[PDB]
């Protein structure tokens, strides 16, 4: 039952049991109906936390592996980093399968398409963070194609203050900065998004203005950090 699963996922989020919350929202998704705004947010928050734990762990262990010299300890950090990498890839592949099999082909609304295509960009970007060779190139290409399609639809259909459109610009600029090592393009994307939102503050909605003005602050933070 969809209502029960959604309610369970909300409880798991308060308990900070993100595996539980992801399992509920995955079951909702697998029922084949389009998701509401609420269920979309729950699914995205759930998997962001499940993948975020591995991304954080991966950075720490990869940093330990590079700072060790002591060959036996360095081997052990390498093997553990590899284990963490396998979990990360399995989570990303799970999300990306849901996006491919249910969410994107079923998205009847511009807002949902942008949301899911942004999410598709994010999870390929997480894969690109840990990918290696000829593999990395195909992954990086998949992330950019998803972000670029999301970007085009959001510019045609959504007001510049829309939190989804602003959040997409934020993460697309991060992709240019850390995946494509392109800070000037990253700054230009983040600065244009901020300036187009601030030229159209009247399109802020009472339900969403707190999200919007928060993401505008995050865009300018990145702008601030990168250009210094």
């Amino acid at each position: 039952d969809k209502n029960e699963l959604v309610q369970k996922a909300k409880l798991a989020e308060q308990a900070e049991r993100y595996d539980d919350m992801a399992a509920c929202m995955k079951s909702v998704t697998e029922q084949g109906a389009e998701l509401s705004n609420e269920e979309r947010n729950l699914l995205s928050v759930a998997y962001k936390n499940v993948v975020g734990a591995r991304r954080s762990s991966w950075r720490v262990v990869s940093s330990i592996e590079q700072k060790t010299g002591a060959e036996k300890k360095q081997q052990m950090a390498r093997e553990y980093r590899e284990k963490i990498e396998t979990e990360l890839r399995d989570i990303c592949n799970d999300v990306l399968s849901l996006l491919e099999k249910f969410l994107i082909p079923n998205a009847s609304q511009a807002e949902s398409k942008v949301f899911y295509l942004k999410m598709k960009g994010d999870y390929y970007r997480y894969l690109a963070e840990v990918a290696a060779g000829d593999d990395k190139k195909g992954i990086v290409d998949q992330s950019q194609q998803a972000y670029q399609e999301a970007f085009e639809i959001s510019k045609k259909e959504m007001q510049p203050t829309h939190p989804i459109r602003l959040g997409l610009a934020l993460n697309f600029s991060v992709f240019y900065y850390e995946i494509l090592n392109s800070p000037e393009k990253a700054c230009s994307l983040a600065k244009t998004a901020f300036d187009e939102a601030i030229a159209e503050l009247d399109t802020l909605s009472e339900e969403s203005y707190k999200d919007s003005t928060l993401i505008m602050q995050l865009l300018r933070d990145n702008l601030t950090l990168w250009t210094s």
């Binding site: 994010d122 959040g167 934020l170 993460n171 991060v174 900065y177 850390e178 993401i215 995050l218 933070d221 990145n222 950090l225 990168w226």
Partner: peptide, 4 residues
């Protein structure tokens, strides 16, 4: 760098 902050992502969403």
């Amino acid at each position: 760098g902050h992502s969403l």
